[model samples]
Target: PFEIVFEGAKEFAQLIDTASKLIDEAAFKVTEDGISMRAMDPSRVVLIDLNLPSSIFSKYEVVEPETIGVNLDHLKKILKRGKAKDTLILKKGEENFLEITIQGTATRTFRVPLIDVEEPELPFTAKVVVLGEVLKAAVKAASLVSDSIKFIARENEFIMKAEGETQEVEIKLTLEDEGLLDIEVQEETKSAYGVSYLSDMVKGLGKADEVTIKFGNEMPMQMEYYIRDEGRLTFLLAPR
Candidate 1:
């Protein structure tokens, strides 16, 4: 049984919103420290990983290690009912239900019917850190008439390029541009990925300023960012 409290429920909700958009269900591994989850898209093109530390929550307690499988969309809908400052208390309930408590100016409680989500078994290091706005802009610009965007990263430069029917565009961010916050490259890398799915993930960016990217030539793309600057969310997409 696990009873956890998160005052930062808004951020948590936005996180699950991202998951529900990509994955309908998942198993959250609850431990003494906090909760973690991993799931692949129904298309099996992307994988999502989220890890939260106990420090991220206002109150976190565990009687023992447990797994909570959930319908993410249903969970997200209920979570969206609260404001950012609301406190959320979740505990195991009778009949395999996960009871949710949202405390705002008034208190309301809801029961989320839990499901059985089979856990998917779950890499990458070419670090390029950029602002959320910058990355989202690049993805949107690249999708002008193109289906996929090519990511190019080399020394002092982070670039995104896409070819349209009659137009091709590349957005460049240099070390001095302020968009490229940091970079660690053993070797430069290039890869192409779907623009629509990438942009969909970007929509989940809640208050994250910087997103850390890692990819290799012909390798899957990896993204890392923080929710509420505490919960870490990572996702990987296959290259075309």
Candidate 2:
């Protein structure tokens, strides 16, 4: 009754991989605009939001809006079978199953059963925009020194710092900095978060030249970026 087709299988595969970093199961709402999902980790330490617009797809058709639950792990495994240049198609099947078709040198099909999942409520806050490369560099440097990283936003500067038992690392950026795009803050803010989670959150954003980040004093951090013409990816990590 419902079907959606994507031009590039690799993009869809990458989206599932990134979302699986925090959640194993999720429910997606398919509508005329596109498909979207929001989920939180079991520990409630992180939240993931995904959106793919219908315009990004070469073929998109939805007879009626429907919510489909899926196991992200299983879905991601299936997508790994596809090549970067392959095309992808998703169709709803009987008995709560999802049919996947990948077209390339050879066409492959897969069927996976749907599951049940309860979506969790998430929080929202103001954000600061910066280059993905800058954030990635800071995360890499922080991981070498500590399990947790501190973020501080002042009038015009954004700071990331980490302290280990013997070593410390710090990276500072300002609105005027070449890598940073802009900084918006109601007041001076600071927070600490686990570097492991932060690193995983940004793993899929490497292709994005810039990303938007949001946080406040001891609040969860939110990071987001667009996937070319496909959709938007968002991540929220609870402060440590």
Candidate 3:
């Protein structure tokens, strides 16, 4: 039997809520190192990667490595029943079900059925570290101006801009700026992407103080950040 206990229920619940936005179902691979999931959205416009090390859990136990299919929305609903300070316990049950137990002032249990999911192959890209708030602000500002946002990365600065009927919004951050941690660019690169997709991708990143963005000219963009001590969440968005 595979079982795991998390001390903080709210964090885990938030993770599910964020992941459910892009993916409806996902298969979590539980290994000796930890648990991980990689999935692409229905239209294949967005891809999500999640990794949670064993160390993140207060208690972790697994007889053998296994893949568990889960409905993210259902899991999120179950997690919502838990209090912020509640401790959560997850176990594999009979008939392909996942048993969830929440412990706080009172105890509660929920059983959710598992499904099957197909994993996809994703491409690789280089990354640059930046402040999460900066990216969030950029996406927010872009939405006010246009449906698509352009990203320009150079040796010294990163820029995002959007143009509408009569007005445009642009945000630029230099490598020397406090918002940017580090940048690695071989040459100048720029790409345009749908602002709505980007906004959805970054809406859940407010909890993270820092984020890493990976991209290439005319290529997909990937955003990554750690979720407390729990794990890392990465999102890949295709260009418009």
Candidate 4:
């Protein structure tokens, strides 16, 4: 009984972007609250926790809990074959599988096998205080200019800096950056993250949307994007 309708084709397209990084095949758990997925890369150095709220869905229904496994990378390739005007229909299947049907000039349907995955629950000991919402595209662009991006959080500012031998990209924001920046820092903190990962993670967000970043000192970082009227998508990156 769970279903969702998306008017903007890019929303589902973006999910494939971030999902490809964590696992080629994955399982999605849909619920009344929303959709969430947490998985670590095979190498274990990276992890992704993604949430797409039901609010983004133009139409949504919550059925029994079902695990739909998908080969994310393959899905991405399939999505690549689609045009922006294509209409997408996704339905859950039996035994960890889902059907993706794309309708347009020519209609195509894909029955993707969902694998058995063990995703860990959020640690009870961990607490995440949201830093603020950020422009995902800007972060991706800044990452292109350096190898690692330094994030400094203080009482009044949140700084994203990428320093290299010849070029540096620094973005400092406060409550004063018009509506573009919002941060809360009780104490000063800083950390460096791989630009490559940041780039991959930001793919889940479209150019015009703001991504909410939730994190704490050395904790797993989370980013959320509102994809549709009733659907939301999220991404989480582990600390480096």
Candidate 3 structure quality by residue, lDDT tens digits, 1-240:
588999889878877776668778999998878899989888889888999999889889988788999888888889998778999998884457889999999999999888887783434333578876787888888889899999888887888899988999998888786557888777787888988787777776664467888788788888877876458988888889
lDDT of 1: 0.82
Better candidate number, 1 or 4, judged by lDDT? 1
Q: Write the per-residue lDDT of candidate 1 for residues 199-219, one digit (tens) a residue.
A: 888876643467888888878
Write down the lDDT of every candidate, Cα atoms only. 0.82, 0.83, 0.82, 0.62
Those runs of model 1 whose alpha carbons end farther than 4 Å from true positions after fitting are: 120-125
Off by over 4 Å in 4: 1-4, 31-34, 53-55, 58-64, 93-97, 117-146, 163-169, 177-179, 218-220
Model 2 lDDT at residue 63: 84
Candidate rank order under TM-score: 1, 3, 2, 4
> Lowest-lDDT window of 10 residues in candidate 4?
123-132
Q: What clash pairs does model 1 have? A: none
In candidate 2, what are the lDDT values of residues 1-240, reduced to their tens digit?
578888779877977886678778999999899999988888888878989898888888898788989888889989988788999999984557899999999999999888887773434334578877787788899999999999998878889999978899998888786546887787888899998888887776664457888887888888887876458888878889
Q: Which runs of model 3 end up more than 4 angstroms from their true locations?
A: 120-126
